[PDB]
Amino acid sequence: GIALGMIETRGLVPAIEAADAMTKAAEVRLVGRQFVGGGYVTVLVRGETGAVNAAVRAGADACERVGDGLVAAHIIARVHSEVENILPKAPQ
Amino acid sequence: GIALGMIETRGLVPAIEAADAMTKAAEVRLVGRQFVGGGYVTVLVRGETGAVNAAVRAGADACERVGDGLVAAHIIARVHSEVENILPKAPQ
Amino acid sequence: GIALGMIETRGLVPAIEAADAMTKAAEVRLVGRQFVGGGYVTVLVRGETGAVNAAVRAGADACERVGDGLVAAHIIARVHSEVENILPKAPQ
Amino acid sequence: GIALGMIETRGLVPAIEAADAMTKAAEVRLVGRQFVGGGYVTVLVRGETGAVNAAVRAGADACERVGDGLVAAHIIARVHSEVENILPKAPQ
Amino acid sequence: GIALGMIETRGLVPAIEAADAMTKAAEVRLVGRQFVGGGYVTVLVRGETGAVNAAVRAGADACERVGDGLVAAHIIARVHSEVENILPKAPQ
Amino acid sequence: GIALGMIETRGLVPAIEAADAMTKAAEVRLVGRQFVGGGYVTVLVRGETGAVNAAVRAGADACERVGDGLVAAHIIARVHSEVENILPKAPQ
Amino acid sequence: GIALGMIETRGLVPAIEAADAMTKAAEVRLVGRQFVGGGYVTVLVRGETGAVNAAVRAGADACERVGDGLVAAHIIARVHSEVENILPKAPQ
Amino acid sequence: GIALGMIETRGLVPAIEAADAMTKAAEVRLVGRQFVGGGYVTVLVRGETGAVNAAVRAGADACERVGDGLVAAHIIARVHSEVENILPKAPQ
Amino acid sequence: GIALGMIETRGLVPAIEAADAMTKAAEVRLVGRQFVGGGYVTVLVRGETGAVNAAVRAGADACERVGDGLVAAHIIARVHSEVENILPKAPQ
Amino acid sequence: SGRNPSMRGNARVVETSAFANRNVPKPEKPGSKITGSSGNDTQGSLITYSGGARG
Amino acid sequence: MKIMQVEKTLVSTNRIADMGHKPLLVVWEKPGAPRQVAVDAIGCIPGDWVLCVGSSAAREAAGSKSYPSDLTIIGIIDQWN
Amino acid sequence: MKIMQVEKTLVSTNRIADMGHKPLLVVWEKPGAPRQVAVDAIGCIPGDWVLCVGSSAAREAAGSKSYPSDLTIIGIIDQWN
Amino acid sequence: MKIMQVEKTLVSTNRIADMGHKPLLVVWEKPGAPRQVAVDAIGCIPGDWVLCVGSSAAREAAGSKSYPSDLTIIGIIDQWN
């Protein structure tokens, strides 16, 4: 699919927990783990809108009480072709 | 393509939200996404003065309450040729 | 041993202290260290779920008093295959 | 059709109301009606995560104040292969 | 005839009274009686929307004072095809 | 006859006591017993409308104090041909 | 896998949620679900002591807030040979 | 031996834990697990009177606080031949 | 099976009770029963970290009140290679 | 009533049913910090996702 | 008010949160006619000849004065050709 | 407001509880025009050329403001052809 | 409601201050159909099949009640034509 689900957390341990929760809670493929600097880490998944809704909700709950906590949890159901340039194609 | 619109946010999640809203709200090219460091992220668009004005306004509204927040949204109608050397030409 | 245990700390000194105590405490193989950015350092150890739990508990106690401190402590007994791409595969 | 949506209710009249709303709301197949015992009656639907997300949501409001009421309304976007053994296959 | 009229009651005696009132009051056919478990007993009638409306209203009034009483009196104007698999086709 | 008498009790001991009282105190015939669930045990009798009335009053008096006691007591002088299906023809 | 981990819930929806959380959290096998009666549903998993403890803890957290709730969580590291006669060998 | 020892519990998790303690404690054989209904689960063990007294005491002490709890723990040294007709011979 | 659990008792009776309870609780192999001298008896067992923690808890609870009593209950999730040269491997 | 002898014992009677459990102590209801357009409606009946997350 | 026929269910996962959980159906005046979406207040199986309300009246039939609905099914026709 | 000719009565037994008991009629702009349904505020026999109101005004025309109707008959045209 | 498709964006810099910052999109039922303009309360790319509310229901869907919107995009259909 093309929907995008992003969770931003203060640190990497909360981000890994969210990424684990997202991927195992619905059919979504993890596409990147970007260190934003200043302690923020953003895990991005792509999939269909229904699956992304389920995953991010599962991810937001899992990492809320982990480490420093959760910063953001956003779901863009369809992503403009322009944004696709900056979004990571596959994890590093 | 001679006007510059910029939205700066704390974290990558609001930056992606702003970029998506700006690109969908008007005919603008997402020239670059920059990790300023310390958690700041800046998304830049370039289009017509009317289009960039609509894009930036839409983006700030969308990302104002997403994650940590919006630092600033700025529109430069005429960009001096000197400044063009410190602006991304294509996204990365 | 496929369970994943992570300790996050502020500053590298607690991170190195946590890894020493975690590896010595139980049979967990150190798998990586990652500079999150902004002062967060994360160390990831794999191993059996029971041993990984014992290691993380030992590491958290030993690294809490050292430096700025402990941010997070985590265990994932079965990490989803999608998340294994973002985890370090071995210490370099 | 690999997303599971369950609605548990006290009595059978709420269960049939929930089942009717769940199947008239989206393209979800009613795979079960299990008399748990003690009054509880559960209705299980299968379909795409988007369709099941909408089905369960519509059903929950339909049966909230029918009979004794509603007990649970749960959606699982990606259900483990192990759990499929305890799930029913046909409503009869 | 596709409309469904269900009445749930605490005990068989209120249900049997409901079945008598429902079938006597209108031109509805009793399709099934179910022991939900824990005390609840549901009686189901299939008929035209008008007949089922009069039957369920007549039944809900008759059994209000009988035994433990009425749990639910619900009218479904039209039943989805999927739900037909979980409804008795003819009385037990 | 055609009149139907019902007494519902919590447990089996009051039901057997009720059924004994009904058949002893009027010209009724015990058509059957039903284990409704959750404790309720129903006893049904058929006879003339006058005899059944005296039989269900005697039964209620008899089981009112036996064990947990009586829940409901009923007579339906005429029973719709539809309800005849759900009434046990004879004690099985 | 010879250790046993049991989660008991009030209703079936919490039971299936516990079974999904338990199986996706650690390497365990869902060996059965039993309708205890009275609205209690037990889900059993067999695995190693380390895996089972991780699973049951994941199961308890997942089903705690789903449906009526969680009744009991139990781990038996060693199950006597006789006890296995009262345990399901494989899921239904 | 023929001495009968019974432990009744609210739920199955207490029953399995009790059965494990009984069989582990003394030379008794698990002969049955009865679902009495309403959330009562009974475990019956046969053995010599000395063995059964130890087995039952272990079972009561082990499941006293596990889950919903313990209802009854009884020991019958010699059951009348009539009662054997209602006691299970082997568990299933 | 590396984690080491040791229980020290005053006398041999509390030590044998600890060994039985330690071994019954979980999968731990009894490696040594050492007569330290002066009345101290030490029972060492070895197994996975999860099992050892369960085993030592059972032993410390079982032998606390038996005889003179319990002296020490200690777990080492991984012993240094040097220490194993002073650990019994088979009990004599 | 008086034809048959009867003894009524005072049993410990607790009903374990769905209706009886309608008022059981329940844990804190799940809340979502989600943003974006996800049909994030909290006025409706409690819908829970995997892990108990509201949705 | 208009008479329409339900054809299929319409699912929009990312709908605005103001819509609640009300299901949506694809109603058209006649087969082959333009397709519209109506909030379903009284449950309709596919093929039902439903009766739909429009304007501000729709918002009330959707269960709240503030509901964002332009078309809302309010009744099912007992007998319609 | 539209001039419509009543065609036949309409009964929807499972309509929402907010419609009250007000009868419903089928009114087409002329014989052959698309059929619509109007709430009958005044007694109207089939074949009468009647005056219909729409939009929010239709709600008050029949009952309170919260009445779910977008087309209500408000009178009978004494001489229309 | 209506099922429209996003074709191109619309930008008027002489807009009234009431419209705020909300984006504007050009939508039609199908290619070649009449072109209407809808306030986009979602993120809708060109080529997205969307569900559009209208009337007073639209004003509340986009921003506040007083917001001057006779058409709003209240969601994107998951799978359409």
PDB file of N, CA and C in Angstrom, chain A residues 10-17 19-20 23-24 28-30 32-33 35-41 43 62 66-68 91-92, chain C residues 4 6-8 10 34-40 42 44 71-76 78-83 85-89:
ATOM      1  N   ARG A  10      11.528   9.564  22.147  1.00  0.00           N
ATOM      2  CA  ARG A  10      12.736  10.135  22.739  1.00  0.00           C
ATOM      3  C   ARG A  10      13.677   8.989  23.085  1.00  0.00           C
ATOM      4  N   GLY A  11      14.511   8.614  22.127  1.00  0.00           N
ATOM      5  CA  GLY A  11      15.451   7.523  22.284  1.00  0.00           C
ATOM      6  C   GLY A  11      15.216   6.433  21.257  1.00  0.00           C
ATOM      7  N   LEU A  12      16.014   5.375  21.380  1.00  0.00           N
ATOM      8  CA  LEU A  12      15.938   4.246  20.460  1.00  0.00           C
ATOM      9  C   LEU A  12      15.219   3.043  21.046  1.00  0.00           C
ATOM     10  N   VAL A  13      15.319   2.820  22.356  1.00  0.00           N
ATOM     11  CA  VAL A  13      14.595   1.709  22.971  1.00  0.00           C
ATOM     12  C   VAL A  13      13.092   1.856  22.777  1.00  0.00           C
ATOM     13  N   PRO A  14      12.478   3.014  23.035  1.00  0.00           N
ATOM     14  CA  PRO A  14      11.048   3.151  22.718  1.00  0.00           C
ATOM     15  C   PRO A  14      10.744   2.959  21.244  1.00  0.00           C
ATOM     16  N   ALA A  15      11.630   3.430  20.362  1.00  0.00           N
ATOM     17  CA  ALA A  15      11.395   3.283  18.929  1.00  0.00           C
ATOM     18  C   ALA A  15      11.416   1.818  18.516  1.00  0.00           C
ATOM     19  N   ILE A  16      12.373   1.051  19.034  1.00  0.00           N
ATOM     20  CA  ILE A  16      12.445  -0.366  18.701  1.00  0.00           C
ATOM     21  C   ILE A  16      11.204  -1.091  19.197  1.00  0.00           C
ATOM     22  N   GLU A  17      10.743  -0.756  20.404  1.00  0.00           N
ATOM     23  CA  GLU A  17       9.536  -1.385  20.925  1.00  0.00           C
ATOM     24  C   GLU A  17       8.336  -1.076  20.044  1.00  0.00           C
ATOM     25  N   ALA A  19       8.425  -0.245  16.809  1.00  0.00           N
ATOM     26  CA  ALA A  19       8.615  -0.956  15.550  1.00  0.00           C
ATOM     27  C   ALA A  19       8.253  -2.426  15.694  1.00  0.00           C
ATOM     28  N   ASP A  20       8.612  -3.035  16.824  1.00  0.00           N
ATOM     29  CA  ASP A  20       8.204  -4.410  17.083  1.00  0.00           C
ATOM     30  C   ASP A  20       6.688  -4.517  17.180  1.00  0.00           C
ATOM     31  N   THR A  23       4.912  -3.871  13.559  1.00  0.00           N
ATOM     32  CA  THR A  23       5.074  -4.892  12.533  1.00  0.00           C
ATOM     33  C   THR A  23       4.344  -6.175  12.895  1.00  0.00           C
ATOM     34  N   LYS A  24       4.284  -6.516  14.180  1.00  0.00           N
ATOM     35  CA  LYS A  24       3.613  -7.734  14.609  1.00  0.00           C
ATOM     36  C   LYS A  24       2.131  -7.530  14.892  1.00  0.00           C
ATOM     37  N   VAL A  28       2.214  -4.509   7.929  1.00  0.00           N
ATOM     38  CA  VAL A  28       2.916  -3.304   7.508  1.00  0.00           C
ATOM     39  C   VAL A  28       4.407  -3.605   7.474  1.00  0.00           C
ATOM     40  N   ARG A  29       5.090  -3.034   6.487  1.00  0.00           N
ATOM     41  CA  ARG A  29       6.517  -3.253   6.290  1.00  0.00           C
ATOM     42  C   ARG A  29       7.281  -2.043   6.810  1.00  0.00           C
ATOM     43  N   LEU A  30       8.190  -2.275   7.753  1.00  0.00           N
ATOM     44  CA  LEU A  30       9.036  -1.202   8.256  1.00  0.00           C
ATOM     45  C   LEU A  30       9.963  -0.725   7.148  1.00  0.00           C
ATOM     46  N   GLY A  32      12.001   2.428   7.535  1.00  0.00           N
ATOM     47  CA  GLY A  32      13.128   3.220   7.984  1.00  0.00           C
ATOM     48  C   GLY A  32      13.103   3.462   9.473  1.00  0.00           C
ATOM     49  N   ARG A  33      14.294   3.657  10.036  1.00  0.00           N
ATOM     50  CA  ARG A  33      14.477   4.137  11.400  1.00  0.00           C
ATOM     51  C   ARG A  33      15.459   5.295  11.320  1.00  0.00           C
ATOM     52  N   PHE A  35      17.322   8.620  12.760  1.00  0.00           N
ATOM     53  CA  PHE A  35      17.740   9.426  13.902  1.00  0.00           C
ATOM     54  C   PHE A  35      17.623  10.893  13.513  1.00  0.00           C
ATOM     55  N   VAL A  36      16.701  11.612  14.155  1.00  0.00           N
ATOM     56  CA  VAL A  36      16.484  13.017  13.823  1.00  0.00           C
ATOM     57  C   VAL A  36      17.473  13.938  14.513  1.00  0.00           C
ATOM     58  N   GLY A  37      18.155  13.448  15.535  1.00  0.00           N
ATOM     59  CA  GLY A  37      19.039  14.338  16.301  1.00  0.00           C
ATOM     60  C   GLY A  37      18.274  14.918  17.455  1.00  0.00           C
ATOM     61  N   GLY A  38      18.952  15.231  18.544  1.00  0.00           N
ATOM     62  CA  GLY A  38      18.286  15.774  19.733  1.00  0.00           C
ATOM     63  C   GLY A  38      17.549  14.712  20.505  1.00  0.00           C
ATOM     64  N   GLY A  39      17.833  13.444  20.234  1.00  0.00           N
ATOM     65  CA  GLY A  39      17.210  12.332  20.973  1.00  0.00           C
ATOM     66  C   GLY A  39      15.979  11.767  20.308  1.00  0.00           C
ATOM     67  N   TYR A  40      15.494  12.370  19.224  1.00  0.00           N
ATOM     68  CA  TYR A  40      14.249  11.911  18.572  1.00  0.00           C
ATOM     69  C   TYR A  40      14.575  10.816  17.571  1.00  0.00           C
ATOM     70  N   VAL A  41      13.850   9.705  17.613  1.00  0.00           N
ATOM     71  CA  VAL A  41      14.023   8.631  16.603  1.00  0.00           C
ATOM     72  C   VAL A  41      12.649   8.372  16.004  1.00  0.00           C
ATOM     73  N   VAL A  43      10.301   5.873  13.550  1.00  0.00           N
ATOM     74  CA  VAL A  43      10.123   4.611  12.842  1.00  0.00           C
ATOM     75  C   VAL A  43       8.957   4.772  11.878  1.00  0.00           C
ATOM     76  N   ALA A  62       2.330   0.585  22.893  1.00  0.00           N
ATOM     77  CA  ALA A  62       3.417  -0.241  23.409  1.00  0.00           C
ATOM     78  C   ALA A  62       4.556   0.605  23.962  1.00  0.00           C
ATOM     79  N   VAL A  66       7.689   3.221  27.749  1.00  0.00           N
ATOM     80  CA  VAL A  66       9.036   2.687  27.589  1.00  0.00           C
ATOM     81  C   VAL A  66      10.009   3.853  27.480  1.00  0.00           C
ATOM     82  N   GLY A  67      11.030   3.854  28.331  1.00  0.00           N
ATOM     83  CA  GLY A  67      12.046   4.888  28.257  1.00  0.00           C
ATOM     84  C   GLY A  67      11.464   6.267  28.486  1.00  0.00           C
ATOM     85  N   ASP A  68      11.996   7.247  27.751  1.00  0.00           N
ATOM     86  CA  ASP A  68      11.521   8.617  27.904  1.00  0.00           C
ATOM     87  C   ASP A  68      10.091   8.774  27.403  1.00  0.00           C
ATOM     88  N   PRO A  91      14.888  -0.001   5.403  1.00  0.00           N
ATOM     89  CA  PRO A  91      15.624   0.308   6.634  1.00  0.00           C
ATOM     90  C   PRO A  91      17.126   0.159   6.455  1.00  0.00           C
ATOM     91  N   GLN A  92      17.867   0.923   7.252  1.00  0.00           N
ATOM     92  CA  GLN A  92      19.324   0.859   7.252  1.00  0.00           C
ATOM     93  C   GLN A  92      19.836   0.414   8.615  1.00  0.00           C
TER      94      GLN A  92
ATOM     95  N   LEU C   4      15.789 -10.169  22.651  1.00  0.00           N
ATOM     96  CA  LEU C   4      16.552  -8.933  22.555  1.00  0.00           C
ATOM     97  C   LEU C   4      16.356  -8.123  23.824  1.00  0.00           C
ATOM     98  N   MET C   6      17.637  -4.460  25.739  1.00  0.00           N
ATOM     99  CA  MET C   6      18.233  -3.164  25.453  1.00  0.00           C
ATOM    100  C   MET C   6      18.265  -2.308  26.709  1.00  0.00           C
ATOM    101  N   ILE C   7      19.371  -1.592  26.898  1.00  0.00           N
ATOM    102  CA  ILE C   7      19.501  -0.589  27.946  1.00  0.00           C
ATOM    103  C   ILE C   7      19.910   0.721  27.291  1.00  0.00           C
ATOM    104  N   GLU C   8      19.203   1.794  27.627  1.00  0.00           N
ATOM    105  CA  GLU C   8      19.495   3.127  27.124  1.00  0.00           C
ATOM    106  C   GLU C   8      20.008   3.987  28.269  1.00  0.00           C
ATOM    107  N   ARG C  10      22.213   7.964  29.325  1.00  0.00           N
ATOM    108  CA  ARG C  10      22.656   9.303  28.956  1.00  0.00           C
ATOM    109  C   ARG C  10      24.163   9.373  29.164  1.00  0.00           C
ATOM    110  N   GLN C  34      24.783   1.951  19.839  1.00  0.00           N
ATOM    111  CA  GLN C  34      24.297   2.941  18.848  1.00  0.00           C
ATOM    112  C   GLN C  34      24.190   4.307  19.493  1.00  0.00           C
ATOM    113  N   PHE C  35      24.858   5.317  18.950  1.00  0.00           N
ATOM    114  CA  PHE C  35      24.753   6.695  19.421  1.00  0.00           C
ATOM    115  C   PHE C  35      23.470   7.272  18.840  1.00  0.00           C
ATOM    116  N   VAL C  36      22.420   7.319  19.660  1.00  0.00           N
ATOM    117  CA  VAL C  36      21.130   7.798  19.176  1.00  0.00           C
ATOM    118  C   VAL C  36      21.237   9.248  18.728  1.00  0.00           C
ATOM    119  N   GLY C  37      21.929  10.066  19.500  1.00  0.00           N
ATOM    120  CA  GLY C  37      22.054  11.484  19.215  1.00  0.00           C
ATOM    121  C   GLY C  37      21.379  12.280  20.313  1.00  0.00           C
ATOM    122  N   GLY C  38      22.015  13.376  20.712  1.00  0.00           N
ATOM    123  CA  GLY C  38      21.532  14.149  21.834  1.00  0.00           C
ATOM    124  C   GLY C  38      21.919  13.599  23.185  1.00  0.00           C
ATOM    125  N   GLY C  39      22.875  12.675  23.240  1.00  0.00           N
ATOM    126  CA  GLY C  39      23.353  12.121  24.487  1.00  0.00           C
ATOM    127  C   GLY C  39      22.815  10.751  24.834  1.00  0.00           C
ATOM    128  N   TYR C  40      21.975  10.160  23.989  1.00  0.00           N
ATOM    129  CA  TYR C  40      21.416   8.841  24.251  1.00  0.00           C
ATOM    130  C   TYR C  40      22.282   7.773  23.596  1.00  0.00           C
ATOM    131  N   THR C  42      22.506   3.485  23.270  1.00  0.00           N
ATOM    132  CA  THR C  42      21.757   2.248  23.445  1.00  0.00           C
ATOM    133  C   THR C  42      22.658   1.060  23.150  1.00  0.00           C
ATOM    134  N   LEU C  44      22.513  -3.199  22.815  1.00  0.00           N
ATOM    135  CA  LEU C  44      21.579  -4.288  22.569  1.00  0.00           C
ATOM    136  C   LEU C  44      22.285  -5.622  22.763  1.00  0.00           C
ATOM    137  N   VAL C  71      18.059   5.534  31.121  1.00  0.00           N
ATOM    138  CA  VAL C  71      16.850   6.030  30.475  1.00  0.00           C
ATOM    139  C   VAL C  71      15.812   4.928  30.317  1.00  0.00           C
ATOM    140  N   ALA C  72      16.222   3.764  29.816  1.00  0.00           N
ATOM    141  CA  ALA C  72      15.278   2.703  29.505  1.00  0.00           C
ATOM    142  C   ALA C  72      15.927   1.347  29.729  1.00  0.00           C
ATOM    143  N   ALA C  73      15.076   0.341  29.918  1.00  0.00           N
ATOM    144  CA  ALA C  73      15.501  -1.054  29.962  1.00  0.00           C
ATOM    145  C   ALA C  73      14.367  -1.882  29.381  1.00  0.00           C
ATOM    146  N   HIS C  74      14.692  -2.796  28.472  1.00  0.00           N
ATOM    147  CA  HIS C  74      13.687  -3.436  27.638  1.00  0.00           C
ATOM    148  C   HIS C  74      14.100  -4.870  27.350  1.00  0.00           C
ATOM    149  N   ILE C  75      13.106  -5.734  27.152  1.00  0.00           N
ATOM    150  CA  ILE C  75      13.319  -7.071  26.607  1.00  0.00           C
ATOM    151  C   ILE C  75      12.211  -7.368  25.610  1.00  0.00           C
ATOM    152  N   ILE C  76      12.583  -7.956  24.479  1.00  0.00           N
ATOM    153  CA  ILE C  76      11.638  -8.474  23.497  1.00  0.00           C
ATOM    154  C   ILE C  76      12.008  -9.930  23.259  1.00  0.00           C
ATOM    155  N   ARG C  78      10.667 -12.320  21.278  1.00  0.00           N
ATOM    156  CA  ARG C  78      10.696 -12.721  19.874  1.00  0.00           C
ATOM    157  C   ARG C  78      10.533 -11.461  19.031  1.00  0.00           C
ATOM    158  N   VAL C  79      11.646 -10.933  18.542  1.00  0.00           N
ATOM    159  CA  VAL C  79      11.626  -9.734  17.713  1.00  0.00           C
ATOM    160  C   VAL C  79      11.124 -10.104  16.325  1.00  0.00           C
ATOM    161  N   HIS C  80      10.175  -9.326  15.814  1.00  0.00           N
ATOM    162  CA  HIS C  80       9.626  -9.598  14.494  1.00  0.00           C
ATOM    163  C   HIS C  80      10.713  -9.463  13.433  1.00  0.00           C
ATOM    164  N   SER C  81      10.560 -10.224  12.348  1.00  0.00           N
ATOM    165  CA  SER C  81      11.602 -10.273  11.328  1.00  0.00           C
ATOM    166  C   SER C  81      11.829  -8.905  10.697  1.00  0.00           C
ATOM    167  N   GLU C  82      10.779  -8.088  10.604  1.00  0.00           N
ATOM    168  CA  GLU C  82      10.928  -6.766  10.006  1.00  0.00           C
ATOM    169  C   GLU C  82      11.841  -5.874  10.835  1.00  0.00           C
ATOM    170  N   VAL C  83      11.778  -5.987  12.163  1.00  0.00           N
ATOM    171  CA  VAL C  83      12.622  -5.159  13.019  1.00  0.00           C
ATOM    172  C   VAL C  83      14.073  -5.615  13.015  1.00  0.00           C
ATOM    173  N   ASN C  85      16.027  -5.909  10.700  1.00  0.00           N
ATOM    174  CA  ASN C  85      16.838  -5.142   9.760  1.00  0.00           C
ATOM    175  C   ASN C  85      17.449  -3.911  10.417  1.00  0.00           C
ATOM    176  N   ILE C  86      16.757  -3.315  11.385  1.00  0.00           N
ATOM    177  CA  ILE C  86      17.246  -2.087  12.001  1.00  0.00           C
ATOM    178  C   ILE C  86      18.168  -2.370  13.185  1.00  0.00           C
ATOM    179  N   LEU C  87      18.055  -3.541  13.805  1.00  0.00           N
ATOM    180  CA  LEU C  87      18.939  -3.880  14.906  1.00  0.00           C
ATOM    181  C   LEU C  87      20.361  -4.103  14.393  1.00  0.00           C
ATOM    182  N   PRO C  88      21.376  -3.764  15.188  1.00  0.00           N
ATOM    183  CA  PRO C  88      22.739  -4.163  14.827  1.00  0.00           C
ATOM    184  C   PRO C  88      22.854  -5.677  14.760  1.00  0.00           C
ATOM    185  N   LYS C  89      23.621  -6.158  13.785  1.00  0.00           N
ATOM    186  CA  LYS C  89      23.801  -7.591  13.603  1.00  0.00           C
ATOM    187  C   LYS C  89      24.972  -8.142  14.400  1.00  0.00           C
TER     188      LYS C  89
END
